[PDB]
């Protein structure tokens, strides 16, 4: 996915879909989050829609292709059981002058 240079804060840039090929009957709900290494001070916000989709929102006003042209967002999908099991999918966000599947295993 991508973000515009003149993008303002709280702007939706992409929607993520948590997929479990081993769940034919849609019994599993997945919790979204940023991996521990990216959970604080990101330039993006994850909003869990609570229906196996999450939004990637801009957390800052303006992105400079020269300062940082690409962001690697490690997104955690987690089950809701004891013990908890998680999977990680890295999202590549590109800065430009101006649907996404995360699998559970």
């Amino acid at each position, epitope marked *: 996915t991508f973000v515009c240079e003149k993008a303002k804060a709280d702007q939706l840039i992409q929607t993520l879909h948590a997929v479990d090929k081993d769940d034919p009957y849609s019994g599993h709900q997945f919790s979204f989050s940023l991996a521990p290494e990216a959970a604080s001070g990101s330039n993006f916000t994850i909003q869990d829609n609570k229906d196996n989709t999450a939004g990637i*929102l801009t957390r800052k006003n303006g992105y400079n292709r020269h300062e940082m042209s690409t962001y690697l967002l490690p997104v955690v999908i987690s089950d809701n059981d004891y013990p908890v099991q998680s999977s990680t999918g890295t999202v590549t966000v590109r800065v430009c002058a101006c649907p996404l599947e995360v699998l559970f295993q």
Partner: antibody
Amino acid sequence: QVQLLESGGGLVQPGGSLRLSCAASGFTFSSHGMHWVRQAPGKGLEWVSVISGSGSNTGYADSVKGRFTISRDNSKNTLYLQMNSLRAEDTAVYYCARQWGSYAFDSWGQGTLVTVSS
Amino acid sequence: DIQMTQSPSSLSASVGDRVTITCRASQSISSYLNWYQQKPGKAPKLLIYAVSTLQSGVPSRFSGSGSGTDFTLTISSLQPEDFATYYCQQSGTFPPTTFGQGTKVEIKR
């Protein structure tokens, strides 16, 4: 949609026993870890017990270990908390809660008050 | 157990104010730090998951940050409906899970 309906609270004497129930609906019950979290009047939140989706794996806070038992009936979509050897310090509002990810709580019951008194 | 301490225990603020609630852990915790809103006579509602994940139907004025031992919940533009007691919770070395003592937010008027 997601609903957690509690029952079973009330007056019980010290050394007594009480059973709480939590009827679930609006989601796949067996897919979630289910928990008991209590709040003493005018105080904070205290996690009590956990049970896996299957009902095989259980956990307890040190404060209730050996006195309380958590169970679930997946056929009836019901969570239980069997309390025994009740003490004055067990007096609280008891909530059942659905697990979200790594033990955060996204849906809670209305609560049920348990008063331990002679 | 890991003890979670919130500051302040009570706060009073004006509509439009940027309010901050601090959460300190007795030891370094990873990123399993969650935030709750509890309205009087109601059960807690999950606002923020794993330090910064905004929940569905939670206004974007609610945000979280922090690492190690210090965490923050920020309400960027306080609204009259934000009246409640807020709790932080550590859930990264489970069992057990421990909560902060709560921060009551009062609306100045």
